[PDB]
């Protein structure tokens, strides 16, 4: 249920073929910090959650976000 | 970063009644349509609100909704009544009758008309502040086009005999206008019982929003008026320009609330007024009340504290918002009722409104007694009188 | 009869009015609710009672909205409030 | 309403009156109540011509009260000659009076002069 | 039921939340009368008032003392035209204005004609813009006032205001402009444009309704006869209680506008282009009223051939729009020489500060659809598509 | 109101029939132009009727209801149309009542062709 | 500091998303976005601090106005499905 | 203190302190109607800065009931 590959896909404007689990948002997915804040917000919108900055700041990779959603 | 003073200046303006604001906000947020946009819902709902408010005003004064014209305030309203009637009947009638205690917008409209070649008679008032009906009868001329008398005075709260004036103007076939800005929502008004032809209404004197008023122009026996604001023909061509929806909605709400709360407000405001005056006089001699206590709206109290200057006392009451009947000239109302020149500077105006509390009254009475006593210990006039000297001691000079 | 609804409503309106920041609105609201209920106490017509109740509920909504707004844009207290 | 005009008002110096029947007290009663302001200023003069005491009572606005209070305050330990040089302008500047409130200083000065004239008028032979 | 999209910003605009947030304190706690000089309730109110005056002045490049608060641009126009005219009556009794001016200007001039004044109504060219040579040639020795609006409220055309300022200055004629549709949307410098009077409406720049302002230059003093008699508020130019919440709102709206003008103009330009370009690539016989070179993109007037205005507006039950159909046809459209038949086939799209691209695309879709349908119902579309020439048939 | 964008009998017939009447009344400068066409039966009854109008929704509706009523009536029963019946049937205010007049002007005009085409 | 700026961006966007009015919501979101994205390459610390302060004031405005919109809400636009 | 309930009620119902016996009921003994008691429970909430749910508030019909609830 990693429909995250859609969210990220639409969020950073990159084809789903690019969403490697081991890809970082800034290095690999070519996004700035503003883009990433909007990203965590959008994910909160999809999965209807709330990520405090403590654990939200960690979200820097696809596997990190998917793993966080699976837990929590 | 400081506690605010008590508000005792209701005749100058009143706070928004929270019901009125709650009525307005929707049209300040989502229903922002122009009431003259005829081709979409944003306009339809706005117009609906506007006509609803018109009905509210009409119900408050006993008129037909079609007779209510929305303005920016009672000032524009008075200009419309006086200048409208005057300019319309100019070819045949060039004389107007009003009184010396009328609000400055009426007096100054009459002034400009005199500058244009009109003849104005300013009726004198009695020492009590009320006019003499015999003088009004004697003043009306064949070419008299308008008679304007205010319902309640804004400086001394005296009530003019509106109904009798209505009788006279009716039997003499002369238009009757009244400046009801200080009476709407505070005392009963029926345009038909009072035989009124035009009436001015101010929104922010009845706990409605500022910048909106209304003028009643009787249509039953049609009263003709020349419009002053040229434009696209809004408000039956009597008041061109975009009708401000949130403001008129507010005005309607204020008039409805007033219609409901009038009796209650008058009972308790009467109580408070009595409390204030009674308490002040039982502790300070030489405090005279300006205005016939028999024909008087208890919400507006004007008191002359002998031998104490108005500004000084107002400054000693830095915690109570008050006024002293206003420019750099003395009160023309107090001169019109023949108040002694010396006392013209020794009067202040307490306004008891819908939200005034008994605490506020007793506090103002405390500071008042205290500081009138203190300023009297500093006053040379109080010393001269208490020392047997007569105020007719031509030791005066400048 | 309708005693429960009327009383619970009385509680809601008084408790909510007490939250006005502005001295004038708070005092006026409380006193007005008190005087109103105390004056309409001996009404027997159930339809008249229901009319009064419905208007009272609408006024409750008004009170809620206006108290919240008053808190959003609050100012200092009166000298009379110590 | 400048800060000083606040302090002299309802915090005033020398509010009262002296014995108008003294030959050593000068009373100046200037003003008129129809115009709004009436100042009564009295002084006591020493054998050596110094002012030893001085009181005032004014009917008027807080600015006029301040002008009079500061007036008596200043005229205290000066000679009748050194007093005539008060100059209303010095009072106004010392109190920061706006234009519309400048009349008060004038009334105060006219008071000082008037009182001195009363005293000097009581010292003459018969 | 769902509400329709708002595309009628020239008729009025919603409050900018910043403006409302600026007003409410004076609708709640600061209810003092700005003319009450004897207590704090009045002092704070007056302070707010003067602050707003400075805000308006900064938006138009004027001195705070030159701003007079009115009830709206209508009152402002009456004050400028009738005030200037009545004041200089003893020596100058001629006024110059245009045929596309707002109805309050036209009707003020009308009443002045009733008072013995002479008014010259300049025609505009087919583009809606005036001919400067015609304006110079119009001025007479006794010409006292020239009134031209900055931006038209029906076709959004921009008049060459600065050049008019030069002309009126060099001929010693007062220049008034009704900038109700231009304030906060395009730059305005009263000194650079040599403007002597200007009308400002609050509810056209996301401010509250029922409040306006008039700029009356003081540098070379312009004297104006007041219309509203009273106690002398607003320097005797406009007696009556200044409604503080409204003037505060207007000031906040003018400052917000001063800040957001460039941004709003960029995105409104993009949107306007999108709308027009997309509509024309899909519907033939769609004409744009107004010179596309000198035009404020916020106001777009289009004539859809062979379709009546009212019918199309009714087919757009989902979009609040306006037109100039018939109980008379748009006089602006007649002044620019629009074909009589097409005067009833024009509607006005307004793209404002808050208009979204979604709203635009929706309006384009529904518009194309119903113009096509109503064209299938139109007998004229059949006459042209069936080879008959509409310039020939006998009518009535 | 109901007839607008819900119209009855919107179209046109063959003007080359000797049995079909085409009435095109109105003018585009005045705002409304109604085109009403009808087919006449062997027995003198109206067999079909279509319209195409350029104007406000009130004129469009007046035309739709117009053709609807002119449907199954005799050539005589049409001459008694009277726009007032249209006004009442749609509840049209005064400023928009003119459409009914045009509507009437249409019926007769079409009849004028029929009697003139026969 | 960078942290304060980022957190501020988060707060303003999340709060703007709560507007009841469609127009106010869209405008607030887009304006915050374009604004931050536009002042991204600012090096002046005084200019950065000024911009942040203005952003805080506007955040307060957004809160109050969102609450007001919720108190006096109406139906949605046809465009919102 | 703690029995300062005897003050609240005393001022709320306007009755001398000698009448606020712990075993005194608001309506029967202290002569109060239901509205008075709503205002009273509210007054207690204000004084002790607490919040009495409607469930247990309806029970408060006597002085001892209020004292027992607060403790
Ligand atoms: P990240 O990848 O580390 O990116 C670096 C960033 C941009 C976060 C930062 O470190 C940086 O580079 N800053 C340079 C300048 C800067 O930080 N500016 C921040 C403040 S700019 C701003 O937000 C303007 C104010 C916006 C107000 C919005 C108005 C909306 C009002 C709506 C009312 C209805
Ligand atoms: P208690 O003795 O046990 O009984 C209580 C009641 C009143 C329910 C009972 O004694 C009784 O009398 N029942 C029959 C009568 C009845 O039901 N009266 C109900 C009156 S409802 C009413 O008065 C509503 C008035 C609303 C006024 C609100 C004022 C708004 C102020 C707004 C400020 C901005
Ligand atoms: C306050 C007052 C006015 C002013 O009305 P506005 O709406 O402020 O113009 C007019 N007449 C009277 C008698 C007033 O007291
Ligand atoms: C909208 C408009 C007005 C109206 O301003 P009001 O405050 O309603 O009087 C005046 N002039 C023009 C050009 C306008 O577009």
Residue numbers in the entry:
A (entry chain C): 4 to 75
B (entry chain E): 54 to 379, 385 to 456
C (entry chain F): 4 to 85
D (entry chain H): 10 to 135
E (entry chain A): 55 to 380, 386 to 455
F (entry chain D): 15 to 132
G (entry chain B): 5 to 85
H (entry chain G): 3 to 73
Which sentences from the paper describe this structure?
Here, we report crystal and solution structures of human NFS1 in association with ISD11-ACP, ISCU, FDX2, and FXN, together forming the ‘core ISC complex’.
Crystals obtained from purifications in the presence of ethylenediaminetetraacetic acid (EDTA) (termed (NIAU)2) did not contain divalent ions and diffracted to 3.15 Å, while those from purifications without EDTA contained a Zn ion bound between NFS1 and ISCU ((NIAU-Zn)2) and diffracted to 3.3 Å. Conspicuously, ISCU binding to the C-terminal segment of NFS1 rigidifies the disordered regions through a ‘domino effect’ and re-creates the ‘standard’ dimer interface. In (NIAU)2 this ISCU metal binding site is empty; the conserved ‘Ala-loop’ (Ala41-Pro42-Ala43-Cys44) of ISCU contacts Glu399 and Trp454 side-chains of NFS1, with Cys44ISCU facing away from the Fe/S cluster binding site. The Cys-loop of NFS1 extends towards ISCU, but its tip (Cys381-Ser385) is disordered and not visible in the electron density. We conclude that ISCU binding dynamically changes the NFS1 structure thereby facilitating sulfur transfer from NFS1.
